[PDB]
Short mmCIF file of N, CA and C in Angstrom, two decimals:
data_model
loop_
_atom_site.label_atom_id
_atom_site.label_comp_id
_atom_site.label_asym_id
_atom_site.label_seq_id
_atom_site.Cartn_x
_atom_site.Cartn_y
_atom_site.Cartn_z
N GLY W 1 -13.31 1.88 -29.30
CA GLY W 1 -13.64 2.90 -28.31
C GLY W 1 -14.76 3.81 -28.76
N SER W 2 -15.28 4.60 -27.82
CA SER W 2 -16.33 5.56 -28.13
C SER W 2 -15.74 6.76 -28.84
N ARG W 3 -16.61 7.67 -29.28
CA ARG W 3 -16.15 8.85 -30.00
C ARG W 3 -15.17 9.69 -29.18
N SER W 4 -15.52 9.94 -27.92
CA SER W 4 -14.70 10.79 -27.07
C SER W 4 -13.70 9.99 -26.25
N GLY W 5 -13.90 8.68 -26.17
CA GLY W 5 -13.08 7.83 -25.34
C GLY W 5 -13.42 7.99 -23.88
N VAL W 6 -12.67 7.30 -23.03
CA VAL W 6 -12.90 7.35 -21.59
C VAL W 6 -12.58 8.74 -21.04
N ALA W 7 -13.44 9.22 -20.14
CA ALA W 7 -13.24 10.50 -19.47
C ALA W 7 -12.73 10.27 -18.06
N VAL W 8 -12.15 11.32 -17.48
CA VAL W 8 -11.76 11.30 -16.08
C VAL W 8 -12.86 11.99 -15.28
N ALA W 9 -13.41 11.28 -14.30
CA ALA W 9 -14.47 11.83 -13.47
C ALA W 9 -13.96 13.02 -12.68
N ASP W 10 -14.83 14.02 -12.49
CA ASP W 10 -14.47 15.20 -11.72
C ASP W 10 -13.97 14.83 -10.33
N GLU W 11 -14.60 13.83 -9.71
CA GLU W 11 -14.22 13.38 -8.38
C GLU W 11 -12.78 12.86 -8.34
N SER W 12 -12.33 12.28 -9.44
CA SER W 12 -10.98 11.73 -9.51
C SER W 12 -9.95 12.86 -9.50
N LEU W 13 -10.21 13.91 -10.27
CA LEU W 13 -9.30 15.04 -10.31
C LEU W 13 -9.33 15.80 -8.98
N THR W 14 -10.52 15.93 -8.40
CA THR W 14 -10.67 16.56 -7.09
C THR W 14 -9.88 15.81 -6.03
N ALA W 15 -10.00 14.49 -6.02
CA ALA W 15 -9.30 13.67 -5.03
C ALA W 15 -7.79 13.82 -5.20
N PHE W 16 -7.34 13.81 -6.44
CA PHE W 16 -5.92 13.95 -6.73
C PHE W 16 -5.38 15.28 -6.21
N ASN W 17 -6.07 16.37 -6.52
CA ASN W 17 -5.64 17.68 -6.06
C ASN W 17 -5.66 17.79 -4.54
N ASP W 18 -6.64 17.16 -3.89
CA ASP W 18 -6.71 17.16 -2.43
C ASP W 18 -5.51 16.43 -1.83
N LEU W 19 -5.09 15.35 -2.47
CA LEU W 19 -3.88 14.64 -2.04
C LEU W 19 -2.64 15.48 -2.31
N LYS W 20 -2.52 15.99 -3.53
CA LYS W 20 -1.29 16.66 -3.96
C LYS W 20 -0.99 17.91 -3.14
N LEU W 21 -2.02 18.72 -2.89
CA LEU W 21 -1.83 20.02 -2.28
C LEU W 21 -2.25 20.07 -0.82
N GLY W 22 -3.25 19.27 -0.46
CA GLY W 22 -3.78 19.27 0.90
C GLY W 22 -3.32 18.12 1.76
N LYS W 23 -2.67 17.13 1.15
CA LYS W 23 -2.27 15.90 1.84
C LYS W 23 -3.48 15.24 2.51
N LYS W 24 -4.64 15.38 1.89
CA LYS W 24 -5.90 14.89 2.45
C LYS W 24 -5.91 13.37 2.52
N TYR W 25 -5.25 12.74 1.55
CA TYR W 25 -5.17 11.29 1.46
C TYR W 25 -3.72 10.87 1.33
N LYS W 26 -3.40 9.70 1.86
CA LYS W 26 -2.09 9.08 1.62
C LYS W 26 -2.05 8.45 0.24
N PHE W 27 -3.15 7.82 -0.16
CA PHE W 27 -3.24 7.27 -1.51
C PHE W 27 -4.67 7.20 -2.01
N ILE W 28 -4.79 7.09 -3.33
CA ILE W 28 -6.06 6.98 -4.02
C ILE W 28 -5.98 5.83 -5.00
N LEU W 29 -6.99 4.98 -5.00
CA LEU W 29 -7.12 3.93 -6.01
C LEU W 29 -8.20 4.36 -7.00
N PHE W 30 -7.86 4.33 -8.28
CA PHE W 30 -8.78 4.68 -9.36
C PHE W 30 -9.08 3.44 -10.20
N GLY W 31 -10.25 3.42 -10.82
CA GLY W 31 -10.60 2.34 -11.72
C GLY W 31 -11.59 2.79 -12.77
N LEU W 32 -11.83 1.93 -13.74
CA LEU W 32 -12.86 2.19 -14.73
C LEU W 32 -14.22 1.88 -14.12
N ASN W 33 -15.22 2.70 -14.43
CA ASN W 33 -16.58 2.36 -14.05
C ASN W 33 -17.05 1.14 -14.85
N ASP W 34 -18.18 0.57 -14.47
CA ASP W 34 -18.64 -0.66 -15.11
C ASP W 34 -19.01 -0.44 -16.57
N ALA W 35 -19.42 0.78 -16.91
CA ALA W 35 -19.75 1.12 -18.30
C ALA W 35 -18.49 1.30 -19.15
N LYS W 36 -17.33 1.37 -18.49
CA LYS W 36 -16.05 1.59 -19.16
C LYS W 36 -16.04 2.91 -19.94
N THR W 37 -16.64 3.93 -19.35
CA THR W 37 -16.72 5.26 -19.95
C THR W 37 -16.01 6.33 -19.13
N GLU W 38 -15.74 6.03 -17.86
CA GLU W 38 -15.09 7.00 -16.98
C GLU W 38 -14.14 6.34 -16.00
N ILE W 39 -13.08 7.07 -15.65
CA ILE W 39 -12.17 6.65 -14.60
C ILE W 39 -12.58 7.34 -13.31
N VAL W 40 -12.95 6.53 -12.33
CA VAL W 40 -13.54 7.01 -11.08
C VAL W 40 -12.67 6.62 -9.89
N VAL W 41 -13.02 7.14 -8.72
CA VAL W 41 -12.32 6.79 -7.49
C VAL W 41 -12.91 5.50 -6.93
N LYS W 42 -12.05 4.50 -6.76
CA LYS W 42 -12.45 3.24 -6.13
C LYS W 42 -12.43 3.41 -4.62
N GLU W 43 -11.37 4.05 -4.13
CA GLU W 43 -11.16 4.17 -2.70
C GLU W 43 -10.07 5.19 -2.42
N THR W 44 -10.18 5.87 -1.28
CA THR W 44 -9.09 6.69 -0.77
C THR W 44 -8.65 6.12 0.57
N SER W 45 -7.45 6.49 0.99
CA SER W 45 -6.93 6.03 2.26
C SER W 45 -6.01 7.05 2.88
N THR W 46 -6.02 7.09 4.21
CA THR W 46 -5.10 7.91 4.98
C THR W 46 -4.15 7.03 5.80
N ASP W 47 -4.15 5.72 5.53
CA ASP W 47 -3.29 4.80 6.26
C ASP W 47 -1.82 5.04 5.88
N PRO W 48 -0.94 5.30 6.87
CA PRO W 48 0.46 5.59 6.55
C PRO W 48 1.32 4.37 6.21
N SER W 49 0.79 3.17 6.45
CA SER W 49 1.56 1.95 6.25
C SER W 49 1.59 1.53 4.79
N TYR W 50 2.78 1.34 4.23
CA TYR W 50 2.88 0.90 2.85
C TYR W 50 2.27 -0.50 2.69
N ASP W 51 2.35 -1.33 3.72
CA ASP W 51 1.75 -2.66 3.66
C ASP W 51 0.23 -2.58 3.53
N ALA W 52 -0.38 -1.60 4.19
CA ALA W 52 -1.82 -1.42 4.08
C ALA W 52 -2.22 -1.13 2.63
N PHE W 53 -1.37 -0.40 1.92
CA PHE W 53 -1.57 -0.09 0.51
C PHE W 53 -1.44 -1.35 -0.34
N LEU W 54 -0.35 -2.09 -0.16
CA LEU W 54 -0.13 -3.31 -0.93
C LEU W 54 -1.26 -4.31 -0.73
N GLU W 55 -1.79 -4.38 0.49
CA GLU W 55 -2.83 -5.33 0.83
C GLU W 55 -4.18 -4.99 0.20
N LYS W 56 -4.28 -3.80 -0.40
CA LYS W 56 -5.50 -3.39 -1.11
C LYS W 56 -5.43 -3.61 -2.61
N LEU W 57 -4.26 -3.99 -3.12
CA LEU W 57 -4.12 -4.25 -4.55
C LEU W 57 -4.76 -5.60 -4.88
N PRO W 58 -5.69 -5.62 -5.84
CA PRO W 58 -6.31 -6.90 -6.20
C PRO W 58 -5.32 -7.81 -6.91
N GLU W 59 -5.18 -9.04 -6.43
CA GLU W 59 -4.18 -9.95 -7.00
C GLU W 59 -4.47 -10.33 -8.45
N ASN W 60 -5.74 -10.28 -8.85
CA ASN W 60 -6.14 -10.74 -10.18
C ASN W 60 -7.00 -9.73 -10.94
N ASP W 61 -6.83 -8.44 -10.65
CA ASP W 61 -7.52 -7.39 -11.38
C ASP W 61 -6.65 -6.14 -11.45
N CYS W 62 -7.06 -5.19 -12.28
CA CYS W 62 -6.28 -3.99 -12.55
C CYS W 62 -6.84 -2.75 -11.86
N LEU W 63 -5.96 -1.77 -11.64
CA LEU W 63 -6.37 -0.44 -11.21
C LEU W 63 -5.25 0.55 -11.48
N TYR W 64 -5.50 1.82 -11.19
CA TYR W 64 -4.46 2.85 -11.16
C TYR W 64 -4.38 3.37 -9.74
N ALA W 65 -3.23 3.90 -9.35
CA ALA W 65 -3.10 4.49 -8.03
C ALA W 65 -2.21 5.70 -8.05
N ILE W 66 -2.51 6.63 -7.15
CA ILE W 66 -1.63 7.73 -6.82
C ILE W 66 -1.26 7.57 -5.35
N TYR W 67 0.04 7.64 -5.07
CA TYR W 67 0.57 7.45 -3.73
C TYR W 67 1.45 8.64 -3.38
N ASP W 68 1.21 9.23 -2.21
CA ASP W 68 2.09 10.26 -1.68
C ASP W 68 3.24 9.55 -0.99
N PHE W 69 4.33 9.36 -1.73
CA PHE W 69 5.44 8.55 -1.27
C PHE W 69 6.38 9.39 -0.41
N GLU W 70 6.41 9.09 0.88
CA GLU W 70 7.16 9.88 1.86
C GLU W 70 8.33 9.09 2.44
N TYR W 71 9.48 9.75 2.53
CA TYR W 71 10.68 9.13 3.07
C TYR W 71 11.67 10.20 3.52
N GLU W 72 12.71 9.77 4.22
CA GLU W 72 13.78 10.67 4.65
C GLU W 72 15.13 9.98 4.55
N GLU W 73 10.95 14.06 2.47
CA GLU W 73 10.58 14.08 1.07
C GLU W 73 9.16 13.56 0.87
N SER W 74 8.46 14.12 -0.11
CA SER W 74 7.10 13.72 -0.45
C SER W 74 6.97 13.81 -1.96
N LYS W 75 6.86 12.65 -2.60
CA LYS W 75 6.83 12.56 -4.06
C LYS W 75 5.56 11.85 -4.52
N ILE W 76 4.91 12.42 -5.52
CA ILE W 76 3.70 11.85 -6.09
C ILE W 76 4.06 10.74 -7.07
N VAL W 77 3.60 9.53 -6.78
CA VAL W 77 3.88 8.37 -7.61
C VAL W 77 2.60 7.83 -8.23
N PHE W 78 2.64 7.63 -9.54
CA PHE W 78 1.53 7.02 -10.27
C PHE W 78 1.84 5.56 -10.53
N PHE W 79 0.91 4.68 -10.15
CA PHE W 79 1.03 3.25 -10.41
C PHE W 79 0.01 2.81 -11.46
N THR W 80 0.46 2.01 -12.42
CA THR W 80 -0.45 1.16 -13.16
C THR W 80 -0.32 -0.23 -12.56
N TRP W 81 -1.42 -0.76 -12.06
CA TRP W 81 -1.44 -2.09 -11.48
C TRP W 81 -2.12 -3.03 -12.46
N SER W 82 -1.32 -3.92 -13.05
CA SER W 82 -1.81 -4.84 -14.07
C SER W 82 -1.14 -6.19 -13.85
N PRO W 83 -1.58 -6.92 -12.81
CA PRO W 83 -0.94 -8.19 -12.47
C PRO W 83 -1.10 -9.23 -13.57
N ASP W 84 -0.10 -10.11 -13.69
CA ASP W 84 -0.07 -11.10 -14.76
C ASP W 84 -1.33 -11.96 -14.79
N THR W 85 -1.90 -12.23 -13.62
CA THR W 85 -3.04 -13.13 -13.50
C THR W 85 -4.39 -12.45 -13.73
N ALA W 86 -4.39 -11.17 -14.07
CA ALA W 86 -5.63 -10.48 -14.39
C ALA W 86 -6.11 -10.93 -15.77
N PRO W 87 -7.44 -10.87 -16.02
CA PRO W 87 -7.96 -11.25 -17.34
C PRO W 87 -7.41 -10.38 -18.45
N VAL W 88 -7.23 -10.95 -19.64
CA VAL W 88 -6.66 -10.22 -20.76
C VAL W 88 -7.52 -9.02 -21.13
N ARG W 89 -8.84 -9.21 -21.11
CA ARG W 89 -9.80 -8.14 -21.38
C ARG W 89 -9.50 -6.94 -20.51
N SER W 90 -9.34 -7.21 -19.22
CA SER W 90 -9.12 -6.16 -18.23
C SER W 90 -7.78 -5.47 -18.44
N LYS W 91 -6.73 -6.25 -18.65
CA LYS W 91 -5.40 -5.69 -18.87
C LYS W 91 -5.41 -4.74 -20.06
N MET W 92 -6.11 -5.14 -21.12
CA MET W 92 -6.12 -4.35 -22.35
C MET W 92 -6.88 -3.04 -22.20
N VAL W 93 -8.05 -3.08 -21.56
CA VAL W 93 -8.86 -1.87 -21.43
C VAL W 93 -8.21 -0.90 -20.45
N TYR W 94 -7.55 -1.42 -19.42
CA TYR W 94 -6.85 -0.54 -18.50
C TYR W 94 -5.63 0.08 -19.17
N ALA W 95 -4.98 -0.66 -20.05
CA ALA W 95 -3.85 -0.12 -20.80
C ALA W 95 -4.32 0.97 -21.76
N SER W 96 -5.44 0.72 -22.43
CA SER W 96 -5.97 1.66 -23.42
C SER W 96 -6.50 2.95 -22.78
N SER W 97 -6.93 2.86 -21.52
CA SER W 97 -7.56 3.98 -20.84
C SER W 97 -6.59 4.78 -19.99
N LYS W 98 -5.39 4.25 -19.78
CA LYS W 98 -4.44 4.82 -18.84
C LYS W 98 -4.07 6.26 -19.16
N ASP W 99 -3.86 6.54 -20.44
CA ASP W 99 -3.41 7.85 -20.89
C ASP W 99 -4.40 8.95 -20.51
N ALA W 100 -5.70 8.63 -20.53
CA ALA W 100 -6.73 9.60 -20.18
C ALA W 100 -6.52 10.13 -18.76
N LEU W 101 -6.32 9.22 -17.82
CA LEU W 101 -6.08 9.62 -16.44
C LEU W 101 -4.71 10.27 -16.30
N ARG W 102 -3.69 9.59 -16.80
CA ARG W 102 -2.31 10.02 -16.58
C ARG W 102 -2.03 11.42 -17.12
N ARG W 103 -2.60 11.75 -18.27
CA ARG W 103 -2.40 13.07 -18.87
C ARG W 103 -3.15 14.17 -18.12
N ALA W 104 -4.15 13.76 -17.34
CA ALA W 104 -4.98 14.71 -16.60
C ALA W 104 -4.36 15.10 -15.26
N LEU W 105 -3.38 14.32 -14.81
CA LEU W 105 -2.74 14.54 -13.52
C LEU W 105 -1.41 15.28 -13.68
N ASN W 106 -1.37 16.52 -13.22
CA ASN W 106 -0.14 17.30 -13.21
C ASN W 106 0.61 17.11 -11.90
N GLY W 107 1.93 16.95 -11.98
CA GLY W 107 2.77 16.91 -10.80
C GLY W 107 3.22 15.52 -10.34
N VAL W 108 3.03 14.51 -11.18
CA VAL W 108 3.54 13.18 -10.88
C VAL W 108 5.05 13.16 -11.08
N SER W 109 5.78 12.65 -10.08
CA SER W 109 7.24 12.60 -10.12
C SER W 109 7.75 11.32 -10.76
N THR W 110 7.06 10.22 -10.50
CA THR W 110 7.53 8.90 -10.90
C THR W 110 6.36 8.01 -11.26
N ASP W 111 6.56 7.19 -12.28
CA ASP W 111 5.57 6.21 -12.72
C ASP W 111 6.08 4.81 -12.46
N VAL W 112 5.19 3.94 -12.00
CA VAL W 112 5.52 2.55 -11.74
C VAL W 112 4.58 1.66 -12.53
N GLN W 113 5.16 0.76 -13.31
CA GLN W 113 4.39 -0.23 -14.06
C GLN W 113 4.39 -1.52 -13.25
N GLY W 114 3.33 -1.73 -12.48
CA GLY W 114 3.27 -2.85 -11.56
C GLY W 114 2.59 -4.07 -12.14
N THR W 115 3.36 -5.14 -12.33
CA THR W 115 2.82 -6.40 -12.85
C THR W 115 2.93 -7.52 -11.82
N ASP W 116 3.69 -7.27 -10.76
CA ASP W 116 3.77 -8.20 -9.63
C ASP W 116 4.12 -7.42 -8.37
N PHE W 117 4.13 -8.10 -7.23
CA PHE W 117 4.31 -7.40 -5.96
C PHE W 117 5.75 -6.98 -5.70
N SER W 118 6.70 -7.63 -6.37
CA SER W 118 8.10 -7.22 -6.24
C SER W 118 8.30 -5.84 -6.86
N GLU W 119 7.61 -5.58 -7.97
CA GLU W 119 7.79 -4.33 -8.70
C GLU W 119 7.21 -3.12 -7.98
N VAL W 120 6.32 -3.36 -7.03
CA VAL W 120 5.67 -2.27 -6.30
C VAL W 120 6.05 -2.25 -4.82
N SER W 121 7.07 -3.02 -4.45
CA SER W 121 7.54 -3.02 -3.07
C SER W 121 8.06 -1.63 -2.71
N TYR W 122 8.03 -1.30 -1.43
CA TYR W 122 8.49 0.01 -0.99
C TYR W 122 9.92 0.27 -1.46
N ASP W 123 10.79 -0.71 -1.30
CA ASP W 123 12.19 -0.53 -1.67
C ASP W 123 12.36 -0.32 -3.17
N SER W 124 11.56 -1.02 -3.98
CA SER W 124 11.63 -0.85 -5.43
C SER W 124 11.18 0.55 -5.84
N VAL W 125 10.13 1.05 -5.20
CA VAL W 125 9.61 2.37 -5.52
C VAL W 125 10.56 3.46 -5.01
N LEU W 126 11.13 3.27 -3.83
CA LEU W 126 12.09 4.22 -3.29
C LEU W 126 13.28 4.39 -4.24
N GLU W 127 13.76 3.28 -4.78
CA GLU W 127 14.87 3.31 -5.72
C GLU W 127 14.52 4.15 -6.95
N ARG W 128 13.31 3.95 -7.47
CA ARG W 128 12.85 4.71 -8.64
C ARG W 128 12.68 6.19 -8.32
N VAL W 129 12.02 6.49 -7.21
CA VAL W 129 11.74 7.87 -6.83
C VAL W 129 13.02 8.65 -6.55
N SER W 130 14.00 7.99 -5.94
CA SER W 130 15.22 8.67 -5.50
C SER W 130 16.25 8.85 -6.61
N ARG W 131 16.17 8.05 -7.67
CA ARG W 131 17.05 8.24 -8.81
C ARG W 131 16.51 9.37 -9.70
N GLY W 132 15.22 9.32 -9.99
CA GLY W 132 14.60 10.33 -10.84
C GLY W 132 13.29 10.83 -10.27
#
């Protein structure tokens, strides 16, 4: 790694706070920039459908996500998305960089380690969020 390691882009923290306090977004997808020096915003969404969220997860690549998980309650959920079929290089750098983003985000209720689509299903996440 570099001397300072990966940084969190200002836009990423801004987007997170806008979601957390303003409900500006339903979810945010974060990723490493191509230089692998910063965690940036890949995409935001206001789509209320959980399926719309799942359909944006790359089947063979990694990302991080924050989801405003709503049910009947609104809980901030952090996802690490690291599918089994992603390249080893990618899995490793996303694992090594995760702490930089995760430690920068205050107010996450639940963390999900997503390695397949069963682990990130709405029902699986609801079970996690509602227990703890």
